[PDB]
Every structure is written in structure tokens, then in C-alpha cells.
Design a protein around this ligand. Structure first.
Ligand SMILES: O=C(Cc1cncc(Cl)c1)Nc1cncc2ccccc12
Ligand SMILES: O=C(Cc1cncc(Cl)c1)Nc1cncc2ccccc12
Ligand SMILES: [Cl-]
Lengths: 300, 305
């Protein structure tokens, strides 16, 4: 019993964190096999942050301009290339602690663990979700760039995020491990704003199922709803539309608890209308949307 | 920016997790040097659990009755002994991944990271606090016994908790690494109930400072209070008393934000008597009490391990 925001154990990722220095800038890199991946903005100066020409800046660099430190050992860069917004530094040593891994691009609503790092050293691990506006609500200070988001599948690490920047509202933007940004963001200091965020509806429903599995039933009601009526109500509270894919994904939780998805959708509509009235669900006074249907099944 | 419930990086502890099997029971063990530590209830049957004589049950066991598995390698047990509610299995191999470590007993209100394990394999890591009623509000399924709680200080792991059981309310009880239970709990299948819990006041204040550091100031007010008046109010809402030690510990956060501790207590007093009024603090509609003053400083200053 119990329901916690739970991150994956970070050990497999910790053995991959290195420090990358280029001139006066120091950030984190991910060392897998003989390649160190890091945000390409490590090559930028003060004059190169509004409109950097990364191809132009990178061509002026030599391998010895990149200082890579893995623990107290300096690694030798023997090649460099850019793939979208990530810099790939070929090193003369394969990381002996390289886990079984994959690079996966995730969709909004998906969760992942973040190993927040500074100077190539892991400082904390937390859990977050890719918001519908493609930002993440992380906990990051200056120097955290290059920190990664991941999930674990048995013994395989799926790297899904690399931290690049903090937007004016304090939220964070980054890329997959192929350097493709999540969202309409660019690695430039030009004025950028995250779109209005919305609640991840499928995740809230999954968390309501987690609460039922844990014995919390106060919010249940005798009503059901059509998918369309639910979506008309949901949109008014800035909740993401619930698709037939989401209904299908909630099938196993629906089968386990005996509460049909549209029946739970009517509970959610009622909660949105009434609030909680001094009550909590799984120790929370707000509807939690950073647990996917997959997370709920795994944890329960 | 941002404020998350953040656990310590679990790698140093992951390299210590092993699976311990005794008869039909399988749980987790902590392999440090040449000793595997695990809950002594691994030697119990369902009947033994009802009223166990652990000295009697342990004397009947031989080293070969304990199957210890570290990854896909079986370790050989060469000795066994009991220290309070923890079983210590001497193995013929020192764990090459043994980090610098200490066994520390924590106080209620202190936080720590839990590496939840099943079959000697780490499955998740989460941050929690030792409640004032000595339970932890964890997330554990059957097979999680032997999962450990820890903190990291520089490169040293301080092991502070080992999971033993789930109480009827769904909360969890366990011991320090010397086998001494936190709280008035016993390792027996019997009627046990956690006491009425209270809010960790010093931690709520630390989290209010974290909110101010992150730009959330709506709850601040012009008022201050005496420590006695605050404690009279706090006692009424099932909040732990705030001591002069807690006030001193909140000193650095008070200096950084410019809000005296008793000034933040007057904000907390008003939050208690009046509620949040539709507002949130750090994305929460409840006052969070599972971040200590040290956790707030660590997170808002980026300390690494
Ligand atoms: O945002 C940047 C640098 C940067 C700026 N403009 C564009 C790019 Cl691609 C990168 N860094 C930071 C990341 N995360 C949290 C931070 C908290 C404080 C200060 C800096 C932080
Ligand atoms: O509580 C026990 C076994 C036990 C029973 N009586 C006394 C002792 Cl010392 C130990 N196990 C469990 C621990 N944590 C979460 C669990 C969720 C479901 C089922 C079992 C769980
Ligand atoms: Cl402090």
C-alpha cells in the first residue's frame, strides 16, 4: 500500500555523468560508449546567445578546446559533431559503466526521472512529466544543463530528455537525445514563452484508479458520461482532451477496479465542479497528473 | 527555479542490494563488506509470525538455509547472528561496491531516500520523512522488506532505515540498521496501530522559505509572533512544537529571504487559522512537511554527490 511519486533508481545514469567545459562555460555531458552527448550551447559565448550560428561556432573549435572530466580523470576528445541541438564529443575511452540503453522521444503526458547534475556530479533525482505545452516543471539551477531524463525497462535505460534551458516562467525546456527540442523552443536567448499549460487528463484518471486500488472511494459517484460530454466539461477547466486511445489505455485499471473509464470520467467531472471539500486523495488536495496509467500499474 | 521532492542519487545503495531467501520467504538484504543485513522475520513461517521466538528459530537454522543472491551470483553464507530485529549473514565475499557508509538513527521529522527493492533488485527511489508517530508514508508492496532508507553526506552513505512491515492503515514501520524499530512497533503478525500523527512544523517553515526563494510570497504578512504564542496555536492544529533549535536551524533561510523565523511563523499561524483560499504554494494546496531546512538549502543551492 501507499502511493508515492517514485523515480527510477539513478545508478545506471550516475555512472554516465561527466563535466564538459568549453572556454568559460561548464555543463553536464552524458558519456555512453565512446561518445559524450551535451547541449550544443556549451560552445556559445556572451555575444553568441541571442542568434548563435552553431555550424559556424563549431567549425572554429578543435578537439582540445573541449575539456571532458569523468570523476577526477580528464578524457581526451578525438572528434566532435553536432546532431540538431546536441553536441557529440567522441572520446578515446569507452565508458566502462555504459548500461544497456536506448534513445526514446516521448509524448506529452509521459513521465520520467531526472538526475539533476552540476559539474558532472549527480545531486538529486526527481520525477516529472512532459507537460502538454512541452515544458517540464523541473528543479534546476545554473549549471544543470546536460542533466538527463530517463526511464528504466528491466535493465535498459531509455534516455528521453536532456536539459537545455529555463523559460521566463521558471519552467524548463530541452531535447530528446537526438537533439530535437520538445516544443516550439530554440536554443537561443530570444524571447520565448511556454504556451498555456493544461492538465494531463489521462494521468489524473490513472491516479484516481490508484486511489481506488489504495481504498480511497469517497469521490466515486453513480454517474457515467459520454466521451464528448466529458471533453466539453474538461476543456473548461484547462484539462487536455481525453481520446479513445486514453480510454483504451485505462482499460486494465478499469478491469481491476470494476469502475468503467467513463464512470471514472464522471467522478472527475464532479471533482472539478465541487473541489475536494477538505478531503484529500492519496494525501493530495489537488488532482495529480504526473502518474501515467503505466506508472500506476507498475507501482500498485 | 523549481522545487521538487528530490531523493539522493541511489547508485551507491543499488550496488549493495541483494536477495535473501529463507525457505519460502524472499526479501531484500543490504550487502556491506562481508555482511548481509536483512529483517530477522525472513526466518519466520506464517504461524511463527503470530508469536515468534527469534532466538529459537535462528538456532535451528544453518548457513546453507540462507540463499543470498547478488545479481546472478549466489553468495555463500559462512555465519549468522541477530542484532535486535536485524539478521546479519556473514558471507565469504566482501562487496566490492561497498561505499563509504555509517549506520545512523534518525529523529522524527528527518527525511531520507528509500530505494524500494523486490527480489534484491532496485525498482524505485523516493524521498520521505520519518513521521512524528515513527511511521513512514511509503509505497511498498509484498517483497519490499529489507528495502533501505539513506542520506548521503559528501561521498558517505548514512543508512538510517530498513523496511520491516506495513501497518493496517497502509503506513510503514521499520528499524535503523542496528535493528531497533522506529516507534512502538514489534516484528510480529499482531494488532498494532500507528499513533495520531502530527505535522512537522520546522519542515513546513523550511518549505515556506523554499516557496519565497522561488517567488511565491502571497502568504507573507507584516506580523511576527512569540515562540510561545506560536506553539500554543501550533498545538491546536496537531503541529509539532517548534523549539529554539528549530529557529536556529532556520537561521540561514531567514537571513537569505529577509523573513525572520517568527515572522514566517505568523504567516504559518494565519495559513492554519484561515486556509489557502483557493491559492497554492509551490503547486500544493496543503502545507508540505517532508522537506527539512537542510533539504531546502541543498536544493536551492545545488549540492552534489
Ligand atoms: O537557461 C539556461 C542557459 C540558457 C539560456 N538561454 C538559452 C539556452 Cl539554450 C540556455 N540555464 C539554466 C537552466 N536551468 C535552470 C537555470 C536556472 C537559473 C539560471 C540558468 C538556468
Ligand atoms: O508487513 C509485511 C509482512 C509482515 C507482517 N507482519 C509482521 C512483520 Cl514484521 C512483517 N510485509 C509488507 C511490507 N510492506 C508492504 C506490504 C504490502 C502488502 C503486503 C505486505 C507488505
Ligand atoms: Cl541550514
Amino acid at each position: 500500500s501507499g502511493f508515492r511519486k517514485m523515480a527510477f533508481p539513478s545508478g545506471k545514469v550516475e555512472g554516465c555523468m561527466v563535466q564538459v567545459t568549453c572556454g568559460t562555460t561548464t555543463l553536464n555531458g552524458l558519456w555512453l560508449d565512446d561518445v559524450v552527448y551535451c547541449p550544443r550551447h556549451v560552445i556559445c559565448t556572451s555575444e553568441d546567445m541571442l542568434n548563435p550560428n552553431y555550424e559556424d561556432l563549431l567549425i572554429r573549435k578543435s578537439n582540445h578546446n573541449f575539456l571532458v572530466q569523468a570523476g577526477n580523470v580528464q578524457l581526451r576528445v578525438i572528434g566532435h559533431s553536432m546532431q540538431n541541438c546536441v553536441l557529440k564529443l567522441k572520446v578515446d575511452t569507452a565508458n566502462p559503466k555504459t548500461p544497456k540503453y536506448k534513445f526514446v522521444r516521448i509524448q506529452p503526458g509521459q513521465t520520467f526521472s531526472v538526475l539533476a547534475c552540476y559539474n558532472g556530479s549527480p545531486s538529486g533525482v526527481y520525477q516529472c512529466a512532459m507537460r502538454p505545452n512541452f515544458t517540464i516543471k523541473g528543479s534546476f539551477l545554473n549549471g544543470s544543463c546536460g542533466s538527463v531524463g530517463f526511464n528504466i525497462d528491466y535493465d535498459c535505460v531509455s534516455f528521453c530528455y536532456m536539459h537545455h534551458m529555463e523559460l521566463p516562467t521558471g519552467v524548463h525546456a530541452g531535447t530528446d537525445l537526438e537533439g530535437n527540442f520538445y516544443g516550439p523552443f530554440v536554443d537561443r536567448q530570444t524571447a520565448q514563452a511556454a504556451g498555456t499549460d493544461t492538465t494531463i487528463t489521462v494521468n489524473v484518471l490513472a491516479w484516481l484508479y490508484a486511489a481506488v486500488i489504495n481504498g480511497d472511494r469517497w469521490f466515486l459517484n453513480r454517474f457515467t458520461t459520454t466521451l464528448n460530454d466529458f471533453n466539453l466539461v474538461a476543456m473548461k477547466y484547462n484539462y487536455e482532451p481525453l481520446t479513445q486511445d486514453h480510454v483504451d489505455i485505462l482499460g486494465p485499471l478499469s478491469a481491476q477496479t470494476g469502475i468503467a473509464v467513463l464512470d471514472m470520467c464522471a467522478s472527475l467531472k464532479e471533482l472539478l465542479q465541487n473541489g475536494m471539500n477538505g478531503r484529500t486523495i492519496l494525501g493530495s488536495a489537488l488532482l495529480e497528473d504526473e502518474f501515467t496509467p503505466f506508472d500506476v500499474v507498475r507501482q500498485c
